[PDB]
Design a protein around this ligand. Structure first.
Ligand SMILES: [Br-]
Length: 95
């Protein structure tokens, strides 16, 4: 048994994107589109495999409750890269 990976912790959320109406700084994202990822890289790769305008299902914990909601992907860079519009603690550019 290897060390446990809980998911990705949100560090910042763009205030003018759909994500701002769901996520908050500090939230832990555990699954995206019904699946658990094993690293921030896999999580990001997955988002990049989608298209701006697509909808992703996000399972996350806010405070002391496991929530679930859909978030529409927006463009996170001038090149059109799809993203939720958040920065992650692993970053220590938006995803
Ligand atoms: Br992270």
């Amino acid at each position: 048994v290897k060390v446990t990976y809980d998911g990705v912790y949100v560090m910042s959320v763009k205030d003018d994107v759909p994500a701002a109406d769901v996520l908050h700084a500090g939230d832990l994202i555990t699954e995206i589109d019904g699946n658990a990822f094993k690293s921030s890289q896999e999580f990001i790769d997955y988002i990049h495999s989608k298209k701006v305008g697509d909808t992703v299902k996000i399972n996350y914990k806010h405070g002391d409750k496991n929530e679930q909601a859909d978030i529409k992907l927006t463009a996170i860079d001038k090149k059109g890269t799809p993203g939720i519009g958040i920065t992650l603690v692993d970053d220590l550019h938006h995803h």
